[PDB]
Amino acid sequence: APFVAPNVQGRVIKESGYNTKTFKPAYVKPKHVIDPNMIIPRQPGEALGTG
């Protein structure tokens, strides 16, 4: 605080102002197409011959 001789009126103190921020999210779209080409082939667990 300011030292002010008791005679005189005193000093005028100031203030400060705030701020803001703003954000939009991004958008994500993975997709798969499932051919027969991908359903048919043998998957590892399957036995040999008669999968």
Added chain:
Amino acid sequence: TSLPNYLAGNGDLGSWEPTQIFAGEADIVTEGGAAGADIEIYQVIAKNAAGAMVPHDPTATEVPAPQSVAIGIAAQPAKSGQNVPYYIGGVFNHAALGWHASLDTLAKRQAVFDRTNIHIGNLY
């Protein structure tokens, strides 16, 4: 500091009489600023060319120098380089204030503050 005094003597302690500063009810405005010279309480003070408070000095020179136009009444004493608080507005007893030489009569002591918020006048 050490010896008492044994001789008889008179108790002439001291004296005091008020310094009444105000002679009116205008607005009492005050500022503060650096001083360019030694300044006493309630001295009338101008601002030198460098913008530092200086005791008022009429006829300070072929052109009036800025010490020559009074700007306020020092509210507390200060040495050079120090900050002086000082009045800029109000109605002030001309007798309480410190004045330059040859700025003797109240007719002059008013003319020095002929427009500002400072007015200078008698007490009754």
